[PDB]
Motif scaffolding. Structure first.
Motif, short mmCIF file in Angstrom:
data_model
loop_
_atom_site.label_atom_id
_atom_site.label_comp_id
_atom_site.label_asym_id
_atom_site.label_seq_id
_atom_site.Cartn_x
_atom_site.Cartn_y
_atom_site.Cartn_z
N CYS A 70 54.99 42.92 50.15
CA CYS A 70 54.42 42.35 51.73
C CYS A 70 53.03 42.15 51.38
CB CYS A 70 54.33 43.69 52.46
SG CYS A 70 56.05 44.54 52.86
N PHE A 71 52.67 41.01 52.22
CA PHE A 71 51.23 40.61 52.34
C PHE A 71 50.40 41.49 52.83
CE2 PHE A 71 53.29 36.20 52.34
CZ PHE A 71 53.08 36.28 50.97
N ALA A 72 50.64 42.35 53.58
CA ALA A 72 49.99 43.68 54.22
C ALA A 72 50.21 44.89 53.86
CB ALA A 72 49.60 43.34 55.68
N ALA A 73 49.62 45.70 53.66
CA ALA A 73 49.73 47.13 53.11
C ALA A 73 50.54 48.05 54.19
CB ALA A 73 48.72 47.92 52.43
N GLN A 106 45.90 51.91 48.00
CA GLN A 106 45.75 51.52 49.29
C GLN A 106 46.53 52.33 50.27
OE1 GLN A 106 46.33 47.40 50.07
NE2 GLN A 106 45.04 47.05 51.65
N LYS A 138 45.83 41.38 49.52
CA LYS A 138 46.15 42.00 50.79
C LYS A 138 45.53 41.45 51.95
CE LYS A 138 49.90 44.59 49.49
NZ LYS A 138 49.67 44.29 47.80
N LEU A 139 46.02 41.28 53.18
CA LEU A 139 45.49 40.70 54.30
C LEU A 139 44.56 41.62 54.93
CD1 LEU A 139 48.03 38.60 54.02
CD2 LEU A 139 47.95 38.61 56.55
N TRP A 188 50.60 34.01 57.88
CA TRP A 188 49.71 33.82 56.84
C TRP A 188 50.32 34.37 55.28
CZ3 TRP A 188 45.14 32.03 57.37
CH2 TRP A 188 44.41 32.12 58.74
N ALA A 189 49.96 33.60 54.41
CA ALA A 189 50.33 33.64 53.01
C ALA A 189 49.08 33.95 51.94
CB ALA A 189 51.24 32.53 52.27
N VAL A 190 49.28 34.64 51.05
CA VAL A 190 48.02 35.03 50.30
C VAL A 190 48.75 34.79 48.58
CG1 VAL A 190 46.86 36.86 49.37
CG2 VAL A 190 46.76 36.39 51.85
N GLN A 191 48.06 34.04 47.87
CA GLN A 191 47.98 33.93 46.67
C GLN A 191 46.89 34.75 45.95
OE1 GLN A 191 49.70 30.53 44.93
NE2 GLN A 191 51.34 30.69 46.36
N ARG A 194 46.39 30.89 52.75
CA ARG A 194 46.90 29.76 53.38
C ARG A 194 47.78 30.26 54.71
NH1 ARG A 194 50.70 27.49 48.44
NH2 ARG A 194 49.02 27.63 46.87
N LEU A 251 50.10 29.39 57.83
CA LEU A 251 51.40 28.90 58.05
C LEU A 251 51.50 28.32 59.59
CD1 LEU A 251 53.44 31.55 56.04
CD2 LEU A 251 52.85 29.35 55.41
N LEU A 279 55.42 30.45 49.56
CA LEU A 279 54.81 31.39 49.98
C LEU A 279 54.16 32.43 48.83
CD1 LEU A 279 57.51 32.27 52.63
CD2 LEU A 279 55.26 31.39 52.92
N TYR A 280 54.93 32.81 47.99
CA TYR A 280 54.33 33.44 46.91
C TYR A 280 54.06 33.00 45.50
CZ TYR A 280 56.50 37.09 49.72
OH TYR A 280 56.82 37.90 50.88
N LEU A 337 60.85 26.88 54.62
CA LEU A 337 59.46 26.99 53.56
C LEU A 337 60.17 27.83 52.18
CD1 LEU A 337 56.83 28.31 55.82
CD2 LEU A 337 56.84 26.03 54.76
#
Lengths: 140, 201, 249, 335, 102, 249
Positions: free
Chosen positions: A52-55, B23, C174-175, C199-202, C213, C215, D111-112, D169
């Motif tokens: 996931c992008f958020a924890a 976290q 992480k966001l 929202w995407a995170v690399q 980025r 979306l 995305l990743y 996407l």
């Protein structure tokens, strides 16, 4: 895909529902073709097995399901007028829908998750059919 | 406010899931007062798991914990031991998935013994393990400062070498200046002690 | 740590994401941003983005602000916008009304390059192109404006100032490490209390650089470099958000 | 004083310390493209190990292409241009991959992860044969410059037709599932290959008189006397022509006509797809179908805001496919 | 313990920087086209100067060569050098025929 | 307010002075600086300079310190130096003993390319070229290494650490605003206490960028931007010393 409705003279009229392993669409139909205000609801099944992008999403209970209040559209003369047994455009056909239009102008919201076999058409007459949930994705 | 021990096993580290676990730990109100990434050896792992000492699972348990670096954490919270026991969830990973999903063992742990975490059971074991892995982390000022326990510890420590050092200081009687006596008694103690040997080149 | 985002750093870290500016425009920005900054009293003035046009004269938009206050439970940055067709001369971008913005929302496709055009809407209404451009820019600015969490802090007289003792965002892949500028520093609202898939995170851990980025608006990019502790955001493209986002995820 | 006076009994820890350092495989691979890797020595005999000379691929002037792209204000950056040039040299030189041509297709966000695509040439409706039509070029894929090369599979008409109906996407795993309702017959590699086929057949162009057809071999040749037009005039759609064959609605380059029966044909055996004519090869971008309204398919991009500058650059950007760009400065051109 | 360089209160721009401002304005004027300036006392526009017809070389090109070699000024200075060459060759008061950056 | 000078801002602000690096070497640096920083266990590693040779293969030299402590009234940095012909692969520069450190200062002329060159001096003494390069780098660092005053502070245990609350140097035009690196924060030693005419400062008040050039070592430049507190330095050119300073001025 399971398609549930209240049909009239061989065609679907009024509120109808269509469910597929990840997708659930519901809205008005006129003469077997969607029209009027509708609603789409589906899950990001492709990224269920990626970090996931958020924890806070890792331990939450709500899944990645989005619901959009869209609206389909039909030519102003085509449909909405029962045939007389013409100055009326034809209904869009199967291979390509020529006069079909789509509209979405509001942000998606949060939607409860979806399981594919919709429990309203639960006895499945078709031989091969998959299933889907959020815990387990596309099983077959 | 109580402090519990915890450790992240190599299975949640070889998969690069350590930071996510940290976290999540911080998200639930915990505070990581001390953390260290390290790599146990066979003897150290066997000494750490002294309570089992020959049970059925001990060979594989000690062979697994020495297969890669682990993380050691000291968590702090008012209900740290019970809250962290709940947060990890049930020990068995399949039972965890069945009963309580969205628990660290259900998500990251797999395959039975590789439950991806380890926690302390009771404050006794918590303090023992914290002192085992963080020898210089201060804690527990109430269980060591009892006059009875203080006298008992002084009794355990002084008869071995300090009494002999005082006797030697009294018999030799070095310079009346206290600093020379302090230096002499320190040298005697660091030279004559039952715990450590005498070192020679 | 940084006081203001650096344009060259932004262009260097967003080169992969496709957010680029021409050589002439780059040099002209380098020589002309300070002049417009000092002509006004703005303590800060930086490039905001580059909107694409139909003739070929892309709209370069820059934004600036003097002081950052906290008011009605939010950080209210009083901003001023400028636009240009070339990097040399900067003209004001006038704010629009409410109903004019509602009408703005109904124009699609890229706006043409000439700022003297007029669009016809419906009783008929005439909409200047500069109004449409300002509408789109304020929409994107309101939607997405990222800064690392707790990179700012309150102070005496209650002004949102930079936090010179910023330790660095922990867990920056992480966001929860990033937040909208409007969100107050003390509050826990971050980039995770909005929709789950916009929202995407690399993240590159060895170089320690994170790219965020948007979306909802596929042109908004942000970088955070942890080793240098420098962050910055840019927009490249037309000011259109993709409403058909769900089918894309 | 307290800080100076605190006792600190530093004692020998039982364990040897371990380093907390991030993984460095990706950055090492990225570095490995700079400089020449010296031939390793054989420990048994100090003579070097057997080796192969580099290959003779035919690539463009990629550094000049990066210069042009930075002049126009589009494409990737200038440093990534150097990285791409070195990585393309790495791909082309490899004697194991006998490559006759390398060309940087582009970069698909995700995305990743992202996708760096390199177009490579080596040296029920059916599908295009290997090396014919849309299957003429193979497509190597990286996630970061200098990393491992993943080959993409050939595309099939079913995949093209299915992809034409979905807007997905990219996730960047290259093994993810694509779509459920408009069922796509493959994983993300197939979807990426189909997208590549569409965009390649739609937006790969060249200057007008540079290329010329040849029926005896059915191939296009370079003029070699071509005189490049002045910059600020390549910004015209009449200056550019297509190079890639059209992609029919059927899903392939040359339509497949199932043979009509010897009797009872009546011309009603063919559906809409099997009976369709398309544009000829080397067709100017001016005749591309216009967008809704009176709008041309390609919009002009200039290198400067003043016509007075002696040498400029000019190009076009695509409207139907946002991100496809073609431009030229002097004798250097790129897409 | 308050650190030595706690804070300072300076104006936005020093009051003795007119020369730097003029140099910056002159260097910024190199870019784009000169906007027409309306005359005082009226609204009639002042016609621009008829430019001179000169000859020069490719300054972006050799700027790129020197940047590739790692010598010379930066690529952001060679572009300004090109614009300055154009301004010099474009002036009518001082009639040049060829220009080159030494 | 910064903690370590960027390698991109230095190359951008010092490009005019000719302190530039090849684009391929710049990308190679961007990739291979963190690799050497982690391979050597150094918390700080920056490009120190670039020295010219009789070949095109110049020596890129980068310095990095792990600890920096006050010792006998000198801020001693335990620096390590690395050299590279190309930006990719780095080698080490071992320190030089005093005998050869005095027999290396008499060897003049711009160096060759191969670091395996032996100079012969007067019986004959054989000295490696790497020793000469180390001597020249040490001399330039002793004479020139410059940072803004009050940018470092002394903590407990007598370690020099960046001053996180450094608000910037007023009067950046004055040489008093700048100091050597090895000056203690308490001591009021600056570049003013050097020879009168060995440092030239040109300050652009508008853009707020000051530039300090060394005249005793002509190839040493140091920029300081004050609007955003960013200072960096680079040495480009041969390492020889300018003896006859009195005649030139």
């Amino acid at each position: 895909g399971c398609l549930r409705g209240e049909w009239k003279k061989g065609l679907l009229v009024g509120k109808g529902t269509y469910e597929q392993p990840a997708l659930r669409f519901e809205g008005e139909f006129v003469r077997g073709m969607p029209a009027g205000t509708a609603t789409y609801t589906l899950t990001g099944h492709r990224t269920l097995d990626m970090p996931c992008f958020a924890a806070q999403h890792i331990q939450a209970e709500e899944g990645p399901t989005l619901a959009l209040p869209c609206a389909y559209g039909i030519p102003p003369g085509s449909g909405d007028e029962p045939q007389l047994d013409t100055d009326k455009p034809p209904l869009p056909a199967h291979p390509k829908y020529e006069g079909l239009t789509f509209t979405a102008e509001q942000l998606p919201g949060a939607a409860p998750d979806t399981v594919f076999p919709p429990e309203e058409g639960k006895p499945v007459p078709i031989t091969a059919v998959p299933a889907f949930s959020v815990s387990t994705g596309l099983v077959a | 406010l109580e402090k519990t021990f915890a450790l992240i096993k190599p299975d949640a580290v070889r998969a690069g899931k350590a930071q996510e676990i940290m976290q999540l730990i911080e998200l639930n109100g915990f505070t990581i007062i001390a953390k260290q990434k390290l790599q146990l050896t066979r003897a150290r792992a066997e000494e750490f798991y002294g309570e089992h000492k020959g049970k059925e699972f001990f060979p594989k348990l000690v062979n697994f914990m020495t297969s890669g670096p682990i993380w050691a954490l000291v968590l702090a919270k008012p209900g740290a031991i019970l809250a962290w026991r709940a947060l990890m969830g049930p020990t068995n990973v399949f039972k965890a998935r069945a009963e309580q999903p969205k628990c660290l063992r259900a998500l990251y742990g797999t395959d039975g013994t590789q439950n991806a975490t380890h926690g302390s059971d009771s404050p006794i074991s918590a303090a023992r393990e914290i002192k085992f892995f963080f020898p210089t982390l201060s804690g527990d000022p109430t269980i060591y400062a009892e006059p009875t326990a203080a006298a008992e510890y002084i009794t355990k420590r002084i008869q071995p070498a300090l009494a002999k050092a005082l006797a030697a200081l009294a018999r030799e009687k070095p310079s009346a200046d206290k600093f020379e006596a302090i230096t002499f008694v320190a040298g005697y103690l660091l030279q004559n002690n039952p715990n450590k040997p005498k070192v020679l080149m | 740590v940084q006081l203001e985002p650096n344009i060259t750093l932004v262009l260097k870290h967003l080169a992969s994401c496709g957010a680029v500016v021409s050589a002439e425009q780059q040099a002209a920005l380098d020589h002309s941003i300070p002049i417009k900054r000092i002509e006004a009293g703005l303590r800060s003035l930086t490039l905001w983005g580059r909107l694409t046009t139909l003739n070929g004269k892309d709209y370069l938009v820059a934004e600036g602000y003097n002081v950052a206050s906290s008011k009605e439970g939010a950080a209210v940055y009083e901003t001023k916008y400028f636009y240009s067709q070339d990097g040399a001369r900067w003209s004001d971008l006038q704010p629009v009304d409410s109903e004019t913005a509602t009408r703005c929302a109904r124009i699609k496709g890229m706006l043409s390059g000439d700022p003297a055009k007029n669009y016809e809407l419906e009783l008929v209404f005439q909409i200047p192109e500069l109004a449409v451009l300002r509408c789109r820019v304020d929409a994107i600015a309101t939607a997405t404006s990222v800064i690392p969490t707790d990179s700012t802090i309150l102070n005496a007289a209650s002004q949102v100032v930079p936090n010179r003792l910023f330790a660095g965002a922990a867990y920056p892949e992480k966001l929860e490490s990033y937040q909208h500028r409007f969100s107050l520093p003390g509050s826990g609202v971050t980039l995770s209390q909005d929709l789950r898939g916009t929202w995407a995170v690399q993240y590159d851990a060895f170089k320690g650089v994170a790219q965020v980025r948007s979306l909802l608006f596929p042109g908004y990019f942000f970088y955070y470099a942890a080793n240098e502790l420098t962050w910055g955001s840019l927009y490249v493209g037309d000011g259109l958000r993709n409403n058909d986002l769900i089918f894309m995820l | 004083l307290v800080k100076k006076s605190t006792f600190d009994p530093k004692e020998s820890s039982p364990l040897v310390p371990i380093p907390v350092a991030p993984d460095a495989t990706q950055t090492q691979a990225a570095v490995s493209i700079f400089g020449d890797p010296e031939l390793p020595i054989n420990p048994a005999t100090g003579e070097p190990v057997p080796a192969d000379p580099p290959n003779e691929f035919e690539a463009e002037n990629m550094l000049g292409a990066a210069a042009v792209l930075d002049c126009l204000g589009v494409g990737l950056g200038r440093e990534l241009g150097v990285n791409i040039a070195l990585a393309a040299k790495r791909i082309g030189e490899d004697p194991k991959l006998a490559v006759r041509s390398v060309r940087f297709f582009g970069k698909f966000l995700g995305l990743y992860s992202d996708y760096f695509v390199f177009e490579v040439a080596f040296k029920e409706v059916p599908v295009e044969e290997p090396g014919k039509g849309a299957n003429k070029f193979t497509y190597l894929v990286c996630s970061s410059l200098g990393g491992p090369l993943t080959r993409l599979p050939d595309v099939t008409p079913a995949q093209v037709k299915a992809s034409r109906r979905i807007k997905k996407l990219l996730t960047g795993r290259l093994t993810s599932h694509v779509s459920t309702y408009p069922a796509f017959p493959g994983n993300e590699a197939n979807y990426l290959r189909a997208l590549i086929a569409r965009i390649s057949a739609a937006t790969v162009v060249a200057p007008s008189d540079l290329f010329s057809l040849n029926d005896e071999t059915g191939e296009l040749e370079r003029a070699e006397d071509w005189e490049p037009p002045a910059g600020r005039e390549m910004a015209a759609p009449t200056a550019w022509v297509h190079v890639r064959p059209h992609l029919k609605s059927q899903g392939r380059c040359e339509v497949h006509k199932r043979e009509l029966p010897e009797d009872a044909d009546e011309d009603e055996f063919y559906n809409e797809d099997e009976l369709e004519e398309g544009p000829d090869l080397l067709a100017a971008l001016e005749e591309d179908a216009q967008l809704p309204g009176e709008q041309a398919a390609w919009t002009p991009i200039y290198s400067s805001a003043s016509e007075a500058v002696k040498t400029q650059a000019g190009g076009l950007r695509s409207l139907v496919w946002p991100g496809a760009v073609c431009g030229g400065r002097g004798s250097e051109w790129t897409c | 313990s308050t650190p030595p360089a706690a804070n300072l209160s300076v104006p936005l721009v020093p009051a003795a920087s007119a020369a730097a401002a003029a140099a910056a304005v002159a260097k910024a004027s190199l870019f784009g086209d000169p906007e027409p300036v309306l005359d005082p006392e009226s609204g009639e526009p002042i016609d621009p100067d008829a430019p001179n017809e000169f000859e020069c070389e490719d300054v972006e090109g050799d700027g790129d060569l020197l940047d590739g070699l790692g010598v010379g000024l930066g690529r952001q200075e060679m572009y300004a050098a090109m614009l300055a060459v154009k301004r010099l060759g474009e002036d009518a008061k001082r009639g040049v025929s060829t220009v080159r950056f030494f």
